[PDB]
Design an enzyme around this catalytic site. Structure first.
Site, PDB file in Angstrom:
ATOM      1  CE  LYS B 164      -3.652   2.467  -0.127  1.00  0.00           C
ATOM      2  NZ  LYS B 164      -3.397   3.786   0.463  1.00  0.00           N
ATOM      3  CB  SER B 202      -3.559  -0.768  -3.906  1.00  0.00           C
ATOM      4  OG  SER B 202      -3.316  -1.195  -2.589  1.00  0.00           O
TER       5      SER B 202
END
Lengths: 360, 333, 348, 361
Positions: B164, B202
């Site tokens: 992330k 992501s």
């Protein structure tokens, strides 16, 4: 006379890409005069106002008429053109060309039963009829007519029945009023009535059990209904088997049990004549010529005991076809599969038919 | 110090439905203090401005902190909360609760290798770093740190790496993926300049601190689970999913039996859009579609669920790229 | 050779509804041979893969060639067919039919300048040119050619310039590669817009650098770009006059009003029913704004997955609220905070 | 006692951005204990399953309760929280904070009538009631109660009535069946609720109501109703905005009707009847006198607009588009992106209310 039906699946890069389609005839491979149905998937929304769908319809008719040397108007009641819009995910836009000719002599060596195609036409369906028992009746008559056209009397040998009906337009309702009649309101009604018509004509539902108050338990396992436009003439396209068939194909059907189920597809394939347990081999896959699956939205938002979003989703229609396409194609390896739906909902259960090779 | 990792998959009827999640702890079934990751699917668009996704993140954190008896700020770097938005079709929204404790005492009869979890944190990633080698490096460091945290040294035993990162998006994701590749030796560092089979990257928000969540196996594992991975070859391919399941420890040829299906605890599949619009020799609309992101997940979900019969599967992706998509499976051992 | 331009706005109930369009010619009202442009709005997505748009293009051509007694291939460079997809909200799908005849008497009656139409064609634009100075140049030449075709020399009398360019395909890129060249839709549009700016002297060929009147679009493989230019001239026998304005932000009506007013309608704030009826067509390009700040507040217009659709919905609401006419040419939706709008009114 | 209502419009950069909202109280500018309504626009789809909307609702309540020093549950029936999802185009997400205190003494110099706020609660609405006369009645009672709460008796002084009803959930239907009752979702609740308003304001005679004409007889309507439905909560809620001569407020409310999808006259009438005197356009100063506009832009009754065909009913994005159009109209007149543009559901006249300043002489 013996019927000999064939299917040729050709790609379309766009709703108006008739290149491969025209090449089918230009090459001498297929006789355009023997074409009895065009069954296509087009790119687009799949919604009631999908003009791409219409674009594909118009393009295909124009191409076919050109190949026949006739003007386009002539194709009026000789060919069934069914374009289903919306080709999400793994679904490759295409047109399945269905031919049928009749022959004096039956080829020998053809095992069991074989594919036969029937077509039928409804009396004009008036707006006052839509979603009501009149529609149910007129469709039933057309389906019986189609069964007769195909030379089939046993409804357990009927494996797919496509009905194209009209829907209610503002001009239609204006017409109804102008003749002092009422209407049910639209597309959802026409579809349900049409499906019931199929059920009646195939003996799946007793005619006594039908009434305008009960139209929208009573189901057909093989109906694939759609509606749209102002054309009052409904149309039936029926795919069945018969012992008198000279075709090198056979059709089967299955029921998809829930939104994640592959067994209905497998059953369609297997009952059509492919012998396998779980997976198909490359060769077996290649024996599958076309799959016609209608993936309407599920009956509920519970799947294998869990909540799903499939009914809430603003893109439900698109998503349903995406899922169906994923399933069918994962089994057959063929992106050019006829995946229709996701209008509205055997409860929870979607029809799927498979056409496979039947060799001497 | 044997690691013992578990996974509990609980449904959510909405992004803020933490009922089943709370019941997990209230029932004594799971110790909230041992929770090391929350990996969820929420209903919504899946797009960069999906506030439902954030709603699920906030709700889950608040629930977990309540169960722990701490204030929500404390969870800051102790738990990895990864919510992927967009749950089309057969995907049932849910949260996979990942626990890990260490036990003194290695328990006898566990076959082969077992699941272990590692976590890592990057140095702040500055906007000047995003999509550039600096990010690649900081992520690599965090992945190495995670490998160490899990007690793993062989990168062939690492089967899933979730990163992330921050945004200012496609760049951040690519750089992060490269970071993973570097840290696992899949790519030599020399080959990297501004001009991985197991990465799941992501990016979003302003938070300069990147985060790594790593799922691997080790011989020292006291876990009753094992992880495997596969590669989805094209958009219609089930073999990658099958390979993930099989290499995780389920022995089958083509289909799973009901029992075997039940042995699959969770699948983590990233279904990014394909590299091309050609599939088994035919044109597809998957790249042209305005709803591509949604459709990709729908297709992936259909595939995964058709094999495992479990709607509560972690299907992410939809981002943009001729094939090649990572899938991990966690099965009983 | 005095030019007489007209505009006939006719509805379409679907991309292939050419009924009213055909009736235009069948009734003797309009000479199909004098048609020089079709400018249409179709129902659909407005996106790069909008096949409804193409459907309208094909249908319109096939209807005009029929009414001309030619086959459809001829309409070749003779007519500009510009179909903009996506007709949200108050926008009624339609086609504006643009005719131009040259003639003998300048009437009088006829006050100040009047509408004139010019058309132009680019040299083939190679894929290596797209988004680059070569495109800029070829477009500029085509715009100059169009100015000449209309008999206009003063660029301050040019009020709308529509450019149709090509976009980059794969087959295009493959071509560029096979000859060792390097490629650079958004690009094609920007370069085209810059071409217009150059040809109208708005920007100096040797250099924030917009054209206030360009309306650019790109697509397909066709290497030949096309210009459609709408201007005024003192030599015009037209009963119409064109003006233009700039929409200042997403909520602004003043640009529309300025277009209307400078075209020849005299009003302060609102139009009367009669004045509204004097407005024959509005051509507004509603590209997404430059920022997500509007009158000091945050808006969602750039984040929205439906931004392209919403922008046109907003533009249509504004235009139609002023003119009361749903059949308005509202294009745009692309990414960029000032938008062009042109109005054609009765001269009278 | 004299009522003093105020409105504070504050921006939100996301559904959970309560920064400016909290600053409203932290600065001493507004007393959180006097807040009686939150009326917000959030980013998102605006559809029945918009979780962002809920996110905004939850966030706002948590913030307000924190500012009050109470726990969030207490706000239960003291504050009306109405979040309408979907903020396309020129609409800036925001929350309008509505306060009302009562004062012993009427300030002097206040011209004409002034803004007053009333609130009301329905008896539980059972699933068997949804879309039926029972709902119509329970809502009517709640509206009368709200009129009384505001100290208003003349229905011509009522300019906006927001009703929040329940919708039919799958568990609701199960409940109805479990008690042997029948049902028929959101469109029904909304129509019945609207009729309730019409009844309570004397716009429609009760005798003329029946389950067979609720949706059918479109003749019967309210010019000022703004209805919405959702969730399982059986308790309906009314928020009513009116004027009265006894008002100590520095605001006044007016209303208008939008004639078709392209019409600005309804908005203008709202503004004008609220107290702004202008012919066609507002000046900057006049614009700044407009504090908030509450417009409901439901889809039109037909697909014909000024004699032409429009796509507004066919469009898959109709709900979004309708609000985009409405927002364009409202904002084009007032120049204020933070306007309350709701609607998108189905039906050709739409209500719009405007709240403007009413200053002492």
């Amino acid at each position: 006379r013996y019927p000999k039906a064939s299917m040729h699946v050709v790609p379309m890069l766009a709703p108006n890409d008739t290149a491969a389609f025209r090449a089918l005839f230009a090459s001498g491979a297929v006789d355009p005069a023997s074409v009895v149905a065009l069954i296509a998937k087009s790119e687009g929304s799949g919604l009631h106002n999908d003009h791409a769908r219409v674009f594909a319809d118009v393009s295909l008719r124009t191409a076919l008429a050109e190949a026949r040397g006739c003007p386009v108007e002539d194709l009026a009641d000789s060919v069934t053109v069914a374009v289903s819009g919306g080709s999400p995910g793994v679904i490759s836009p295409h047109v399945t060309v269905v031919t049928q000719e009749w022959v004096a002599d039956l080829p020998a060596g053809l095992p069991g039963v074989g594919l036969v195609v029937g077509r039928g036409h409804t009396e004009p369906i008036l707006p006052e009829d839509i979603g009501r028992t009149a529609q149910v009746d007129k469709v039933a008559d057309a389906v019986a007519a189609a069964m007769l056209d195909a030379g089939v009397t046993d409804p357990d040998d009927v494996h797919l029945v496509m009905v194209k009906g009209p829907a209610l337009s503002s001009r239609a309702v204006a017409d109804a009023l102008s003749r002092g009649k009422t209407v049910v309101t639209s597309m959802c009604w026409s579809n349900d009535a049409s499906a019931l018509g199929v059920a009646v004509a195939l003996g799946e539902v007793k005619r006594d059990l039908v009434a305008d108050d009960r139209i929208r338990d009573l189901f057909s396992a093989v109906a694939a209904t759609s509606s749209g436009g102002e054309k009052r003439g409904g149309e039936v396209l029926l795919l069945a088997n018969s012992a008198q068939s000279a075709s090198e194909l056979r059709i089967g059907h299955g029921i998809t049990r829930d939104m994640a189920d592959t067994e209905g597809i497998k059953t369609a394939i297997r009952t059509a004549g492919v012998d396998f347990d779980c997976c198909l081999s490359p060769a077996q896959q290649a024996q599958v010529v076309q799959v016609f699956g209608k993936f309407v939205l599920p009956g509920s938002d519970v799947l294998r005991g869990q909540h799903i979003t499939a009914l809430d989703d603003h893109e439900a229609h698109h998503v349903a076809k995406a899922v169906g396409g994923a399933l069918v194609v994962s089994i057959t390896g063929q992106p050019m599969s006829f995946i229709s739906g996701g209008e509205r909902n055997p409860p929870g259960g979607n029809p799927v038919a498979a056409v496979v090779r039947r060799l001497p």
